Write a protein that binds this ligand. Structure first.
Ligand SMILES: [Mg+2]
Ligand SMILES: [Mg+2]
Ligand SMILES: [Mg+2]
Ligand SMILES: [Mg+2]
Ligand SMILES: [Mg+2]
Ligand SMILES: [Mg+2]
Lengths: 236, 5, 236, 5
């Protein structure tokens, strides 16, 4: 790896610089290098990792949706035949997206998840595993589509089980996991009732636990609670 | 699209 | 080149798709491939080329400024010594920027400019040559800094001379050239009076020629005239 | 920064 010769601390420092400069591809490459040092990640470091790859894949997904939409239009009756280019370029972006997802899933499997013993780390990584299988599922059309969806579901479910046992209902990781698993249900698993039920129950259980929190924890938890409410408003 | 984090 | 096997028309088609998807690095790679086919570019194609590389280098410049600012702060009295990382990463981004600039200048020299006989094409390419030497100048600190600045100046000046002889004062390429050469004077050549004089004269001469134009040409010309006014307002 | 095109 091209980051093999750089100090772990230097990679973390540069990931932060890359974040300030909105250089998310660089940020991701630095964090990959850091993970590949083989030491566990701290809370801050886990966040750096997730921020970097979320921004990179988020851009790829946005582009994929633009291209897939143009491609769909081209296959409507009355559309002039324009050749293979739209499919080719959608495929190019798709392949790049899949590569990023496989990279992240690779880091999680080798060996972030297996070394993660504390709830905050294990739930966070299992959420990411669910998230990156979900992105693979968004573009899947083949023999393995069902297995990709189940891989997402399984990772989210394991994360859910741990989060309910080991974290308070207001914990931002628990909230974020629930938000994304709810989206999984709505957009990937064709289960809008499960999505709505999950978002509602998570919101209400968190509401009931806000009284235990500091002002700063309250701000963190309520921010994610609002995203649950936003989705519920979108869906009802 | 819906919100995720 | 990796685009050597793709049809010219397919490269142009994909550059447009990449633009719609905000995939400017891809857009640039497709347009480079198109230029390397060796045929002259049409008006639309020249615009695609300039759009792609403007967006790519624009992002690099923005990042370079973030990093250079952090680096400057680190070299203020009282700043804790944090090691070589900020300089290294600013250098990394700088080297990438320089590479993009050299790529564009390469395309212009081999062989876009020499084949450009009509004013609209020749002025547009010479403007781009000025622009990409200007970006090299923004990051130059060494033995060749003066020569880089003069390379920008010379290209802009040749473009200016042709534009004044061959184009009306409202021509958007003439206006755009003047806008950017004026910025060159202000930001690179330490000549704010020349910058102001150029922006003012260009604005006033265009104003006097608007009566000759259609509604659509009027909209195009006045848009760039407003940018001249915006700069003048910034500088006076 | 000033406007360029
Ligand atoms: Mg070491
Ligand atoms: Mg595919
Ligand atoms: Mg339940
Ligand atoms: Mg051919
Ligand atoms: Mg340098
Ligand atoms: Mg003069």
């Amino acid at each position: 790896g091209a980051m093999g010769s750089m100090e772990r601390a230097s990679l973390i420092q540069k990931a932060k610089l890359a974040e300030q400069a909105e250089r998310y591809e660089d940020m991701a490459a630095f964090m990959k290098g850091a993970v590949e040092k083989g030491e566990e990640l701290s809370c801050e470091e886990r966040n750096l990792l997730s921020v970097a790859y979320k921004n990179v894949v988020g851009g790829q997904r946005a582009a994929w949706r633009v291209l897939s939409s143009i491609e769909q239009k081209s296959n409507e009756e009355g559309s002039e035949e324009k050749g293979p280019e739209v499919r080719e370029y959608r495929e190019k972006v798709e392949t790049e997206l899949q590569g990023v997802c496989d990279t992240v899933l690779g880091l999680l499997d080798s060996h972030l998840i297996k070394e993660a013993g504390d709830a905050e780390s294990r739930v966070f990584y299992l959420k990411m595993k669910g998230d990156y299988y979900r992105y693979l599922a968004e573009v899947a059309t083949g023999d393995d589509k069902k297995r990709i969806i189940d891989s997402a579901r399984s990772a989210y479910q394991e994360a859910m089980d741990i989060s309910k046992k080991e974290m308070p209902p207001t914990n931002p990781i628990r909230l974020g996991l629930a938000l994304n698993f709810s989206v999984f249900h709505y957009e990937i698993a064709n289960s809008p009732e499960e999505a709505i039920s999950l978002a509602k129950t998570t919101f209400d259980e968190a509401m009931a636990d806000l009284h235990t929190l500091s002002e700063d924890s309250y701000k963190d938890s309520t921010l994610i609670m609002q995203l649950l409410r936003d989705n519920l408003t979108l869906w009802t | 699209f819906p919100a995720t984090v």
